[PDB]
Amino acid sequence: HMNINKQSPIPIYYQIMEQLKTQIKNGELQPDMPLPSEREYAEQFGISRMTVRQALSNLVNEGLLYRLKGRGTFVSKPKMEQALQGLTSFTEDMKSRGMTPGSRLIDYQLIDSTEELAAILGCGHPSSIHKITRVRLANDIPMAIESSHIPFELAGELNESHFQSSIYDHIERYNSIPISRAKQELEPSAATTEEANILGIQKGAPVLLIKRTTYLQNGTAFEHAKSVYRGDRYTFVHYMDRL
Amino acid sequence: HMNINKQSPIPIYYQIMEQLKTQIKNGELQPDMPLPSEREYAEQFGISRMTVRQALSNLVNEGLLYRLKGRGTFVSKPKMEQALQGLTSFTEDMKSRGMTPGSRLIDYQLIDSTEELAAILGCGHPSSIHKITRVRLANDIPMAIESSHIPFELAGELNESHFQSSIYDHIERYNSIPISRAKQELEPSAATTEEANILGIQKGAPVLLIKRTTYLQNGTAFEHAKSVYRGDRYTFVHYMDRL
Ligand SMILES: CC(=O)N[C@@H]1[C@@H](O)[C@H](O)[C@@H](COP(=O)(O)O)O[C@@H]1O
Ligand SMILES: CC(=O)N[C@@H]1[C@@H](O)[C@H](O)[C@@H](COP(=O)(O)O)O[C@@H]1O
């Protein structure tokens, strides 16, 4: 049950919205069962129903809750289906979903090649390697953290405008060769404290750890990326044939 | 950071082995850094170096640890790669890696079809559906928990001889039609208390939640399975194409 502090400067409706949000983040409210009623909340904390109703309606207007007639109010659990077999960019993914892709830069460095990285990319050593770490956003909501390693010569000099747009698009134009094939490795994990803060989920929340090596049509590897995708807003789908 | 109790009837070497195991399963120990030396352990707990050596040697022999001539003793992180595009059985997967597949029956129930399950499987409603829940073992080590829903008339009566062998082999045999295609949905999760106890991992440890819907060559779906796969023993690998 929530913790409501009436002597706090923070308005009670706001407390409710945040506690509820926090409760949805740590799973204490699942999407199969309805929330306590307006009346139950009010009586529980000795507060007005209109205060409860203000918090709940705001959460409905955010799309965090929904009202099913005669059944109650429920936690919304929108999932995107990520097709694993089609090589696409984040930008392409969002557009196809009628959503607006965004990025926030966590870190950029141009780093020295290592024998490990050069063997993965089949690039030169010593060489310079873009290391691009971004939060990827969908309608301003963080969906993933990606850290992409790209040999300098396959991208040339990069600036903030590149980071704010599509790296795959730049890659195809800069190289005049299409992006063709990738290998991905998937591991379930728990969000670190840092990953959780950036993603707006709980410490330890479920995430998919993804390692991708991406290739141009001519067989050249241009990317080795490691990423963390939110478990709570993604389902990953693929198909299998016999033989 | 182990806990050693000298007045316990349990021998100290056994405590060390168990405490270290518990540490490897809660992440206190990591495969990157060397374990503390015999000396560090012995001095810390006020015990014999040969008691420490006995525990560490046992763990090496169990595969849980390995030694390195100049760097010291390390945590083994053996992970299987699970290829995601060929449709195969557990039994097939384990044989391919030269491991012995096994099963322990968690529960079997013949259940009434639900409208939900009937839509998924495209089977009759009312009808009867096998609900087969097994721990799947690799050399007697729990790898996964699977709960497979199979329409009764696609498998007939089932007994412990079926549960202890390959369901997919039985499915092909019984129907005289081979398995051909599947859809799979992947989701990162944390092991529930019950899932963790069965898999021998920590409560809340990372697992991949997998939903598989599997089809015969004639297009009939014979299986809807929900599974939990151990994060600590599995890497999921697939390839992508630009299409
Ligand atoms: C899990 C994964 O590896 N996802 C890739 C990412 O590695 C790649 O860098 C990004 C480029 O997107 P962009 O073209 O929009 O910058 O597309 C995908 O999100
Ligand atoms: C994640 C997943 O869906 N795994 C399937 C499982 O659904 C199927 O029931 C089992 C049959 O194996 P068997 O033929 O050895 O009994 O093979 C695979 O492990």
Side-chain angles (χ1 to χ4, degrees), chain B residues 11-76 78-231:
Chain B
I12 290 154
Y13 86 89
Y14 193 105
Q15 301 187 33
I16 294 167
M17 295 182 63
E18 281 299 292
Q19 289 268 324
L20 283 181
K21 283 169 171 175
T22 297
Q23 272 189 357
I24 300 195
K25 269 157 190 191
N26 65 8
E28 289 200 16
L29 293 190
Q30 299 285 313
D32 200 38
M33 307 287 296
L35 277 82
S37 69
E38 303 194 345
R39 186 182 150 186
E40 313 182 41
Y41 278 131
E43 286 178 358
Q44 176 163 354
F45 294 105
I47 59 172
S48 169
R49 280 190 211 187
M50 300 307 299
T51 297
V52 175
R53 176 175 304 168
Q54 177 189 357
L56 291 184
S57 301
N58 288 344
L59 295 179
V60 167
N61 296 359
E62 296 183 17
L64 288 216
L65 299 180
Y66 63 104
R67 287 185 174 105
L68 279 169
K69 311 303 150 284
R71 308 315 320 157
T73 283
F74 290 89
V75 181
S76 323
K79 280 183 164 177
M80 283 164 290
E81 298 195 340
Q82 180 74 31
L84 274 190
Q85 280 138 326
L87 172 55
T88 59
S89 72
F90 185 84
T91 286
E92 285 167 344
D93 296 342
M94 286 306 161
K95 287 183 177 179
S96 82
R97 310 169 176 123
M99 313 183 79
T100 300
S103 294
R104 195 241 300 183
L105 181 71
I106 294 302
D107 175 76
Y108 169 82
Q109 284 177 83
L110 190 60
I111 71 165
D112 275 313
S113 67
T114 64
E115 219 165 10
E116 173 179 346
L117 251 174
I120 289 168
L121 286 166
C123 67
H125 180 70
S127 72
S128 298
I129 299 170
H130 296 286
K131 188 190 178 182
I132 312 162
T133 308
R134 295 178 298 167
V135 205
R136 311 307 307 280
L137 299 308
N139 299 337
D140 294 309
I141 298 175
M143 293 300 161
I145 302 172
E146 300 172 344
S147 185
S148 178
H149 305 67
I150 300 171
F152 185 88
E153 296 300 337
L154 297 182
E157 302 278 350
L158 297 172
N159 59 66
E160 187 68 34
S161 65
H162 303 104
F163 304 148
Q164 289 288 318
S165 53
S166 165
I167 289 289
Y168 281 9
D169 281 343
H170 174 72
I171 289 294
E172 292 197 316
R173 227 153 41 212
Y174 184 87
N175 292 278
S176 308
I177 309 162
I179 62 176
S180 54
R181 184 177 177 71
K183 168 182 180 179
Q184 226 169 230
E185 290 169 37
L186 313 181
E187 191 176 325
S189 202
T192 68
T193 301
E194 297 76 24
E195 291 164 354
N197 288 357
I198 290 173
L199 291 167
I201 61 181
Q202 208 80 79
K203 169 182 172 51
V207 295
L208 197 62
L209 253 170
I210 307 181
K211 277 190 280 177
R212 180 185 287 194
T213 304
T214 327
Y215 296 81
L216 296 175
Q217 197 180 15
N218 67 347
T220 295
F222 72 88
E223 171 184 63
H224 184 65
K226 319 187 73 154
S227 306
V228 165
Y229 274 66
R230 281 177 79 165

Side-chain angles (χ1 to χ4, degrees), chain A residues 116-128:
Chain A
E116 188 201 82
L117 256 182
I120 299 175
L121 292 167
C123 67
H125 185 49
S127 67
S128 288

Side-chain angles (χ1 to χ4, degrees), chain A residues 84-87 92 179-182 184-188 206-207 212 231 236-242, chain B residues 79 84-87 92 179-188 206-207 212 236-242:
Chain A
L84 291 175
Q85 283 155 305
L87 178 47
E92 288 168 339
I179 297 170
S180 187
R181 180 160 179 92
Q184 266 189 171
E185 302 184 353
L186 314 179
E187 172 180 344
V207 298
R212 175 183 293 191
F236 303 81
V237 186
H238 69 100
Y239 297 82
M240 296 179 296
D241 299 323
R242 181 64 163 169
Chain B
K79 280 183 164 177
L84 274 190
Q85 280 138 326
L87 172 55
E92 285 167 344
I179 62 176
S180 54
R181 184 177 177 71
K183 168 182 180 179
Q184 226 169 230
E185 290 169 37
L186 313 181
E187 191 176 325
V207 295
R212 180 185 287 194
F236 298 83
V237 177
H238 70 98
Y239 298 80
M240 340 175 70
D241 290 292
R242 184 75 169 173

Side-chain angles (χ1 to χ4, degrees), chain A residues 1-67 70 72-76 78-243:
Chain A
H1 293 128
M2 297 182 205
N3 187 29
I4 299 294
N5 298 96
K6 305 173 190 176
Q7 310 319 115
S8 167
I10 298 183
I12 292 172
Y13 87 87
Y14 189 106
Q15 295 188 36
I16 296 177
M17 290 180 71
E18 281 294 301
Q19 298 250 1
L20 271 181
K21 278 168 185 178
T22 290
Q23 274 185 357
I24 307 184
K25 297 296 194 175
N26 63 15
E28 297 191 271
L29 296 157
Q30 324 273 23
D32 59 315
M33 302 281 290
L35 276 75
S37 57
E38 186 181 280
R39 287 170 48 197
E40 289 176 280
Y41 275 134
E43 295 191 56
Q44 164 158 325
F45 301 108
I47 64 187
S48 168
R49 274 210 227 170
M50 305 306 303
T51 296
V52 174
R53 181 180 310 182
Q54 181 183 2
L56 289 181
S57 294
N58 287 343
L59 289 169
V60 161
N61 296 342
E62 285 197 41
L64 296 184
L65 289 188
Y66 65 104
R67 288 177 185 111
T73 285
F74 304 86
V75 174
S76 290
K79 289 303 193 85
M80 298 165 219
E81 304 196 11
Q82 184 72 39
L84 291 175
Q85 283 155 305
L87 178 47
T88 60
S89 68
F90 185 83
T91 295
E92 288 168 339
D93 292 339
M94 294 298 95
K95 281 178 173 174
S96 80
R97 263 112 92 164
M99 306 171 83
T100 306
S103 292
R104 173 205 149 195
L105 192 277
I106 291 306
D107 188 69
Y108 171 75
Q109 313 171 49
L110 187 72
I111 69 173
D112 287 316
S113 57
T114 69
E115 258 190 349
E116 188 201 82
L117 256 182
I120 299 175
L121 292 167
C123 67
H125 185 49
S127 67
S128 288
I129 292 179
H130 295 285
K131 186 194 189 182
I132 310 164
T133 305
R134 306 179 287 170
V135 203
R136 313 305 303 280
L137 312 158
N139 296 345
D140 225 26
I141 312 169
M143 294 292 103
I145 299 170
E146 302 174 336
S147 188
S148 183
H149 298 59
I150 297 175
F152 178 88
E153 63 187 273
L154 293 180
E157 198 186 328
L158 307 171
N159 58 68
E160 186 71 59
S161 68
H162 292 103
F163 306 150
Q164 291 298 303
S165 182
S166 161
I167 293 296
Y168 276 13
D169 210 73
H170 171 77
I171 289 295
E172 293 192 317
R173 301 194 266 86
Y174 183 88
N175 293 285
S176 303
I177 318 176
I179 297 170
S180 187
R181 180 160 179 92
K183 176 192 174 170
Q184 266 189 171
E185 302 184 353
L186 314 179
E187 172 180 344
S189 178
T192 63
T193 300
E194 294 70 36
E195 295 160 353
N197 282 348
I198 295 177
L199 287 167
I201 57 189
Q202 216 86 75
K203 170 173 169 60
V207 298
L208 198 61
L209 246 66
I210 307 178
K211 196 190 304 184
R212 175 183 293 191
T213 300
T214 326
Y215 299 84
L216 302 176
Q217 203 178 246
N218 67 349
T220 296
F222 72 93
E223 178 186 50
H224 181 66
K226 49 180 51 193
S227 312
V228 158
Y229 273 64
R230 278 178 85 161
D232 66 334
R233 289 187 83 134
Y234 276 101
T235 290
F236 303 81
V237 186
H238 69 100
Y239 297 82
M240 296 179 296
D241 299 323
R242 181 64 163 169
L243 276 66

